[PDB]
């Protein structure tokens, strides 16, 4: 990388992180995508 | 050539074995149904289920056959058919360089002359049949499963068996010993239908019923 | 309580069987009708069906009174022989 | 950017982040939740509207093999921007 | 005698004259490749794939629109049949867009497909394609118009099936664009289907795009509940998720169409819903409760209240099954006040005599009528399949129609004889003139509208309507099977639950006031907590909570349509049935289960435990609701005429004004309809102006 | 080797946009059904995948995704020491991919330079 | 049609004669079977676990059927005999660690939408 | 024609016993025969012609991780293709499976002529072409 180093991007990391696992900074899998089905609000007032 | 991607396809062969196909249909015209040749040289002998035994010992034996060496013994289930089973026999001849395909129909109730006699290849082999569709064989030696775990349930090559099966496993820490469940997938397998609604090949268009 | 609360005949279009309940129908229908214009009687045919005829008793209560073959007098006789009862 | 959440979680781009009642997220304590800072949506919109005095462009991205199929935009609404579907460059007729 | 004789491939078919080749060649079972040619729209030619090689002959024709003679051999395998398909799409694919990867037809592409079957490898083109503007028309309908293959299938569907002409051709040569020239949406209650018929990406479903792959989804066969025409559709579901709605084919039915509230609904499936049971707390207050709870209150409830102070009133939506188990229920209470916010005129026959209410002459029956008489209906909104169906009919058959109602818009052209009720009676003495020509008219028919009898003078209507059937029918200028009087109805539930006994209408809860009234799926409203006397008890067993919900205290959630294998009939009387596209969500269980369950706990348990064991209660309760894609035939109408002779009924003057008169209130009927989010945009978009919909839409 | 097949990572356009378009074709030609997308309208018009997670426990690295792919999103990267402790931590989402993309780039970018041309 | 040659019984009467000595050839080996396993169970519940296994198969009424599960139980027999099912396999058939699912309407409607 | 200890079957094929399926997977699950409608996207008819078994559809949750449509159906997926109705019904109840079968729908023919398109009298002449 000295004689050729890689072209320069912003989104590429400016410090890498070895292997995180075990230590309190893994990677928890996790839903991406929102929910589905919208509940039904109730109404607050006291009706009748 | 002006075929340089098309398989280059042999006449000679062809009537070599459509010639043998004509020979072995006029040997044995009990059991010897229909005989056919794939346009890629590949001969074809539909026989009868109670000559499965006969027409191998001739392929075996004859001097103009000597087809000795079953290369495998697999059947094809079909439920459209009665007799959704259909057993294939794949045997090699060394001395004429040539192979041959015989092929049986077999619903599920009906056993079928086990080729263990005529080939001792086949002993194996027919206990993967019965294991994995439950075509039963008769006259076997040691008939019993030789793929699926002990006591399974269910034949699973059957068309109607599903691919996740009935039943996983799991080590219950209860009774400390491992355990079998029904079965809970993570994430149901996607089924994809990518068939494509337009014609394919015209060659093979069945005429309509 | 039995009160009489709903009768259902249920005919075939066409079947012999269910020729008896036609014959009534297009003529003692309408002069029952005007008798009890409070009951539903309930007329709900089908094609190759029993000519039956069902009774809703009150407090769910189902009689199945089968009117195979039955002639239109027949089918009247076994009308008022139901509803003779007013509960 | 990231935008925290009210319950105190970064929120990613899709919008998603753990409602405050949500039971799923003891997983996160202890640990860190995965979420990327270089959201692609705002990104995109750094990038200047290039002016091309032709009433049809073609983009591929750049890099050509190493880019998105090469696509036509047609620059003739002067009223807003034609922008490619694959990477989301605009472009914009210089008063036609 | 007239049968002409062809050879396709060489084997010989029997034609009738007149039949085009590319029909020929489907009797053996070759389909020639096309784009433009769709089969309910007519011919136009610019496909040019159709191209086939016709023996002894030099010139290729154009299988889509040449009739075949005596004696031809269509040679569709011909060497010289393959080299025009290789050139004509190759043509095609000359300057279509590379947008696979983005574009929704990807997976379902006509022209992705015949590239694979019959086209080249590769291509010679090393040119720069072209490129289109983009167009609006709507925020239903996704325009890429650069992938565009001018076949002019939304063109002759928008001037042939929908009757509006917005869709058109612009500009000559390649630079021809297909669109509408000045900014306006296409909008009809069938504008969703140029989505359908448009071979390519280039008319997509903005709701849908690029949410799915077609490889991906399942289709599940259903009908649709939102209309009571009962189109029937192919809900396509992914991982238990609804995505699309699409329409299949029944030739009599829905043809190969859907109404657009059909089809943009799905969104309603998914907000808000009904997933728990709710109790009132001790401030009134709906909160979450288990099902146990829910079922103990009600069942008490209904356990010390007996006689006539329980009710129901059966929504527009529910199903059979659910209809015939809460009337079980109540039965089993003494309850006979089965009711149903629909108002049909139970004086004279009313629901006894099957074919008082129904369409008896079948939807496929229009295509045979010469004269129809509209009554206090507009079928473009209350029956978007009907009025196509009497637009087609139009068309082909030169049918006449006419119309009583109000002066709408019905795509074709009727001759309105004034919206006066008295029109009525006029025809049934004969001084209108239009009574004179339903006297010539052989098959005459006449539709009076669900939503006229929804009128306080509706058994007058109904009266009226069924005299002028019994004049035309004493003329023998009509034949013995033609049945004249129809009616065409409007929510989904009505022949169902008619057919079992619901009274119908609501008059009888006015009439008795009860207090443990039940609302099952009832969401028009007819019936407050005002009418009803203090300290009601209302069982709300809805999917949505829209109307119905605020007002109980025991919201119990059901299954919608899609979640449920529930049988639907029609307004015609085929009584279809729905399949499980995917469970309801949260602790939502099915309907008949539901009520079922509770009858146990209440300790009058039902018979019936599985949903073939209800389906065979169904069954003797009414043998043609089990008779599945079957129109029973029905019969006595005289008897019925004559029993609308008794009692008099005065008509009024209010003019018959349909509930729906132009597209905005088209929209938002039905509690999935009006609970959902892409519909909303569609009325939104017809009140205002076209800036008010529009969206960076792209793929 | 350049091509060599290790941990998956998707890559952004020049501009800093994602290459994902959500076409589903590395989904479709997935031997193992590994890859799971869901796709929505984005808010500024072209949309991306709104989840997007790749079974790192369940792929088989055969790169049929990187093949499929027309816009060369979805790679296998050169790493191949991402062993982990738990089972959770190999069930990749589009977040950690996403950071995969923005932290091997310098090299993918590299490796496909290296080898763009035998494709 | 009505006629297909059999398995290894003509008619129900021998079908019935080779289900009696395979339960034979199963009541026998049940206590050798749980000492040889160290099986948890007693002997007791072994016997009558045979006998309910041997009762669901009695709807069967085809000479080639009941002959189909003859052979098969004799296989589970010789798997059993010589070792070569574990205590995992024999435990199998007692059904220990999944919880009772309830029979009655009303317990499914409450769990799910269970048919 | 067949002397091979032939014997009177004339019960009907219960193989139900034999393929190891549990007990609830064979009488609470309704199969459906049908013939596939066609893809009303597109206009081919090739996935049209042979007759389909499926099973109705189950519960489908979604997992406490990431959250992919979970399933506990074996019988979910499985799809069965048969040539006739016939062959279809007949695998149905042979094992043990309560049925319900949809006839085929075949598209109507429609006459159709190009000559219709420029009419002197009838409503069918087009404006546009
Ligand atoms: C040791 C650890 C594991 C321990 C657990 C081990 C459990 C498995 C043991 C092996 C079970 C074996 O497969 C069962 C089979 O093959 S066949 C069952 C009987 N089914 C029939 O024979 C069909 C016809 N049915 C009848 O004949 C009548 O039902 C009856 C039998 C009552 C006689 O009637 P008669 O008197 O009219
Ligand atoms: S319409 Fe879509 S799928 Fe078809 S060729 Fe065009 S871009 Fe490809
Ligand atoms: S928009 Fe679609 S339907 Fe209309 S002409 Fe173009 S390809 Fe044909
Ligand atoms: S490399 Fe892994 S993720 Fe990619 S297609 Fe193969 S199995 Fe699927
Ligand atoms: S193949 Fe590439 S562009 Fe297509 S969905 Fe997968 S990652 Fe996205
Ligand atoms: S099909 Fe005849 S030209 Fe398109
Ligand atoms: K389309
Ligand atoms: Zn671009």
């Known amino acids: 990388p000295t004689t050729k180093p890689p072209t320069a991007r912003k989104y590429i990391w400016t410090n890498h992180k070895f292997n995180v696992s075990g230590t309190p900074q893994q990677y928890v899998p996790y839903s991406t995508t929102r929910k589905k089905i919208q509940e039904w609000v109730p109404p607050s007032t006291p009706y009748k | 050539d002006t075929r340089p991607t098309i398989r280059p396809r042999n006449d000679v062969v062809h009537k070599q074995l459509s010639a043998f196909g004509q020979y072995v249909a006029e040997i044995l015209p009990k059991y010897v149904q229909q005989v056919q040749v794939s346009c890629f040289n590949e001969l074809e002998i539909f026989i009868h289920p109670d000559g499965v035994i006969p027409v191998l010992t001739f392929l075996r034996d004859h001097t103009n056959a000597q087809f000795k060496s079953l290369a495998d013994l697999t059947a094809v289930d079909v439920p459209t058919r009665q007799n959704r089973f259909e057993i294939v026999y794949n045997l090699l001849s060394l001395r004429f360089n040539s192979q041959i395909r015989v092929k049986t129909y077999t619903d599920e109730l009906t056993p079928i002359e086990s080729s263990v006699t005529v080939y001792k290849a086949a002993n194996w082999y027919e206990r993967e049949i019965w294991d994995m569709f439950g075509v039963f064989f008769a006259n076997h030696p040691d008939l019993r499963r030789i793929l699926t775990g002990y006591g399974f349930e269910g034949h699973p090559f059957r068309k109607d068996f599903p691919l996740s099966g009935y039943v996983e496993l799991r080590y219950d820490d209860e009774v400390k010993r491992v355990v079998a469940e029904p079965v809970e997938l993570a994430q149901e397998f996607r089924k994809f239908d990518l068939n494509s609604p337009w014609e394919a090949f015209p060659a093979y268009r069945q005429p309509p019923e | 309580k039995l009160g009489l609360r709903e009768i259902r005949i249920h005919l075939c279009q066409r079947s012999p069987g269910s020729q008896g309940v036609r014959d009534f129908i297009e003529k003692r229908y309408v002069e029952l009708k005007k008798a009890n214009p409070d009951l539903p009687i309930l007329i709900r045919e089908c094609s190759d069906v029993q000519p039956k005829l069902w009774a809703r008793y009150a407090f769910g209560q189902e009689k199945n009174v089968s009117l195979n073959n039955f002639s239109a007098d027949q089918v009247t006789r076994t009308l008022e022989n139901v509803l003779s009862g007013k509960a | 950017g990231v935008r925290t959440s009210p319950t105190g979680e970064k929120v990613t781009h899709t919008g998603q982040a753990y409602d405050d009642g949500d039971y799923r997220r003891v997983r996160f304590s202890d640990r860190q939740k995965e979420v990327n800072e270089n959201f692609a949506i705002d990104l995109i919109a750094e990038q200047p509207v290039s002016e091309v005095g032709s009433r049809v462009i073609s983009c591929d991205g750049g890099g050509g093999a190493l880019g998105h199929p090469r696509v036509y935009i047609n620059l003739d609404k002067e009223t807003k921007t034609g922008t490619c579907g694959y990477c989301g460059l605009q472009f914009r007729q210089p008063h036609h | ?699 | 080797s350049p091509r060599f097949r290790g941990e998956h990572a998707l890559r952004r356009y020049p501009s800093g946009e994602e290459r994902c378009i959500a076409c589903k074709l590395c989904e479709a030609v997935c031997p193992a059904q590994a890859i799971t997308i869901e796709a929505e309208p984005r808010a500024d018009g072209s949309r991306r995948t709104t989840r997007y997670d790749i079974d790192m426990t369940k792929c088989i690295y055969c790169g049929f995704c990187q093949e499929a792919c027309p816009v060369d999103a979805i790679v296998e990267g050169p790493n191949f020491e991402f062993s982990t402790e738990t089972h959770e931590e190999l069930l990749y989402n589009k977040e950690k991919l996403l950071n995969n993309g923005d932290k091997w780039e310098a090299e993918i970018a590299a490796n496909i330079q290296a080898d763009y041309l035998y494709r | 049609g009505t006629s297909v040659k059999p398995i290894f019984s003509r008619d129900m009467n021998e079908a019935k004669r080779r289900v009696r000595e395979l339960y034979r050839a199963w009541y026998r080996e049940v206590p050798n079977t749980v000492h040889l396993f160290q099986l948890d169970i007693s002997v007791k519940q072994g016997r009558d676990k045979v006998r309910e296994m041997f009762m669901k198969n009695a709807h069967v009424t085809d000479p080639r059927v009941v002959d189909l599960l003859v052979i098969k139980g004799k296989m589970e027999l010789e798997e059993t005999i010589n070792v070569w099912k574990q205590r995992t396999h024999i435990m199998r058939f007692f059904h220990e660690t999944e919880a009772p699912r309830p029979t009655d309407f009303l317990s499914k409607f409450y769990v799910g939408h269970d048919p | 024609t067949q002397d091979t200890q032939l014997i009177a079957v004339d019960e009907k094929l219960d193989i139900t016993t034999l393929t190891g399926v549990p007990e609830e997977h064979i009488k609470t699950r309704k199969v459906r025969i049908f013939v596939p409608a066609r893809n009303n996207m597109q206009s081919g008819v090739n996935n049209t012609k042979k007759w389909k078994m499926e099973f109705d559809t189950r519960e489908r949750w979604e997992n406490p991780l990431m959250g992919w449509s979970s399933t506990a159906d074996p019988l979910s997926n499985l799809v069965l293709t048969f040539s006739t109705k016939e062959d279809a019904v007949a695998f149905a109840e042979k094992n043990g499976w309560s049925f319900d079968v949809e006839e085929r729908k075949v598209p109507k023919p429609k006459s159709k002529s190009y000559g219709a398109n420029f009419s002197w009298n009838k409503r069918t002449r087009v404006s546009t072409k």
């Not at chain 5, 080299?83 to 004509?88: H, I, L, Q, T």
């Not at chain 5, 002759?156 to 297909?178: H, K, P, Y």
């Not at chain 5, 229009?366 to 978007?384: C, H, K, Q, S, Y």
Request: glycine share 8%; charged share 25%.
């Open chain 5, 1 to 699: 005698s007239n049968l002409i004789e062809v050879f396709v491939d060489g084997q010989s078919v029997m034609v009738e004259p007149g039949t085009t080749v590319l029909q020929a060649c489907e009797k053996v079972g070759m389909q020639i490749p096309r784009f433009c040619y769709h089969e309910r729209l007519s011919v136009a030619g610019n496909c040019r794939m159709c191209l086939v090689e016709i023996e002894k002959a030099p010139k290729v024709v154009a299988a889509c629109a040449m009739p075949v003679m005596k004696g031809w051999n269509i040679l569709t395998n011909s060497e010289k049949s393959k080299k025009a398909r290789e050139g004509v799409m190759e043509f095609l694919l000359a300057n279509h867009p590379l947008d696979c990867p983005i574009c929704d037809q990807g997976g379902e592409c006509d022209l992705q497909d015949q590239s694979m079957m019959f086209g080249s490898d590769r291509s010679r083109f090393l040119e720069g394609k072209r490129a289109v503007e983009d167009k609006n028309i709507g925020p239903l309908v996704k325009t890429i118009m650069t992938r565009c293959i001018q076949c002019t299938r939304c063109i002759r569907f928008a001037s042939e099936i929908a009757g509006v002409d917005d869709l058109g051709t612009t500009g000559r040569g390649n630079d021809m664009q297909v669109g509408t020239y000045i900014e306006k949406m296409f909008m009809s209650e069938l504008s969703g289907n140029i989505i359908d018929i448009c071979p390519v990406g280039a008319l997509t479903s903005k709701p849908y795009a690029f949410t799915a792959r077609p490889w991906e989804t399942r289709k599940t066969e259903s009908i649709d509940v939102m209309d009571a025409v009962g189109s029937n559709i192919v809900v396509s579901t992914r991982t238990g998720e609804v995505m699309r709605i699409l329409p299949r084919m029944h030739e009599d039915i829905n043809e190969e169409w859907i109404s657009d509230k059909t089809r943009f609904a799905y969104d309603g499936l998914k907000r808000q819903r009904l997933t728990q049971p709710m109790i009132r707390n001790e401030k009134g207050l709906l909160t979450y409760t288990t099902w146990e709870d829910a079922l103990s209150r009600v069942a008490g409830m209904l356990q010390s209240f007996q006689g006539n102070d329980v009710a129901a009133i059966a929504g527009g939506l529910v199903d059979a099954e659910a209809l015939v188990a809460l009337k079980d229920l109540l039965n089993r209470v003494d309850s006979d006040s089965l009711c149903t916010e629909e108002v049909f005129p139970t004086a004279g026959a009313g629901t006894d005599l099957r074919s008082n209410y129904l369409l008896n002459t079948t939807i496929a029956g229009v295509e045979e009528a010469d004269v129809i008489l509209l009554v206090g209906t507009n079928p473009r909104f209350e029956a978007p399949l009907f009025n196509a169906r009497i637009r087609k009919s139009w068309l082909h058959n030169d049918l006449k129609v006419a119309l009583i109602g109000s002066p709408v818009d019905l795509t074709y052209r009727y001759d309105h004889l004034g919206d006066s009720p008295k029109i009525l009676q006029d025809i049934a003495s004969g001084n209108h003139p239009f009574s004179q020509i339903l006297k010539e008219a052989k098959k005459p028919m006449v539709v009076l509208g669900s939503s006229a009898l929804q009128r306080s003078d509706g058994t007058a209507i109904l009266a009226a309507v069924s005299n002028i059937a019994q004049n035309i029918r004493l003329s023998s200028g009509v034949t013995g099977d033609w049945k004249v009087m129809n009616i065409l109805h409007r929510i989904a539930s009505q022949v169902a639950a008619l057919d079992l006994g619901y009274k119908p209408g609501v008059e009888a809860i006015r009439k008795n006031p009860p207090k443990v009234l039940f609302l099952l799926g009832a969401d028009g409203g007819c019936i407050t907590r005002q009418d009803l006397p203090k300290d009601c008890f209302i069982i709300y067993q809805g999917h949505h909570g829209d109307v119905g919900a605020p007002m109980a205290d025991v919201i119990l959630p059901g299954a919608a349509y899609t979640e449920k294998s529930a049988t639907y009939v029609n307004t015609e009387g085929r009584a279809q049935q729905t399949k499980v596209a995917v469970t309801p969500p949260g602790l939502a269980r099915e309907d008949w289960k539901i009520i079922r369950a509770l009858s146990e706990i209440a300790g009058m348990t039902l018979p019936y435990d599985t949903l073939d064991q209800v389906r065979s209660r169904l069954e003797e309760v009414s043998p043609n609701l089990v008779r599945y894609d079957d129109v029973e035939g029905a019969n006595y109408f005289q008897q019925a005429n004559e029993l609308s002779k008794l009692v008099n009924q005065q008509l009024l003057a209010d003019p018959l004004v349909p509930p729906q008169l132009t597209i905005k209130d088209f929209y938002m009927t039905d509690s999935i309809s009006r609970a959902s989010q892409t519909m909303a945009k569609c009325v939104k978009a017809v009140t205002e102006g076209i800036q008010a919909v529009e969206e960076p839409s792209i793929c």
